[PDB]
Amino acid sequence: DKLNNLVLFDKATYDKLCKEVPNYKLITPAVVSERLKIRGSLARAALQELLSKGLIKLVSKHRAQVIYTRNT
């Protein structure tokens, strides 16, 4: 029915993100938003933050689609 995606990081959500996102083999805003039940703009912000800390590898950048994946 009506989705109730979180607008901001909860504590358990942030911890689960930080220790379960960096092993997915495919990192896009859509997959994190759908399987973490979060708003996609904050999904993009979280992915940008994980890229900023040097832990996730960007593959290609676009205005339409951005894709990341694991370092190793």
Binding site: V7, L8, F9, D10, K11, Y14
Partner: protein
């Protein structure tokens, strides 16, 4: 980042509810009398980060933005940008927001009904 300890899910301003889980520049537009343009200009005069969400504003921020929307002319918001420019009874420039919009609307309808012009008579004959 993470949720602040004072994140307001529901705001109660101008006798109207605000959904706090939204960007501030549209949670302002959630009430009557303000759309996207006036909300952006109010927030730029108020010097508030528009990237920030609505639910994490402090009491000083909400009281100053409410203050600015009640008296926009004082805060160099121009005359042309306002909702009511020349009130017919008392000529002055203002911005009717929550209940004053409904007040001026229904009293304009009563004024058009009392004088029996075409517009008011047609509007009340429409129902």
């Amino acid at each position: 980042l993470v949720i602040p300890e004072k994140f307001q899910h529901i705001l109660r301003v101008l006798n109207t509810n605000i959904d706090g889980r939204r960007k501030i520049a549209f949670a302002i537009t959630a009430i009557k009398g303000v759309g996207r343009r006036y909300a952006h200009v109010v927030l730029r005069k108020a010097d508030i980060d528009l990237t920030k969400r609505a639910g994490e504003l402090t009491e000083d921020e909400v009281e100053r933005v409410i203050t600015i929307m009640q008296n926009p002319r004082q805060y160099k918001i121009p005359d042309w940008f306002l909702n009511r420019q020349k009130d017919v009874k008392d000529g002055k420039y203002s911005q009717v927001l929550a209940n004053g919009l409904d007040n001026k609307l229904r009293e304009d309808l009563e004024r058009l009904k009392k004088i029996r012009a075409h517009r008011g008579l047609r509007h009340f004959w429409g129902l």
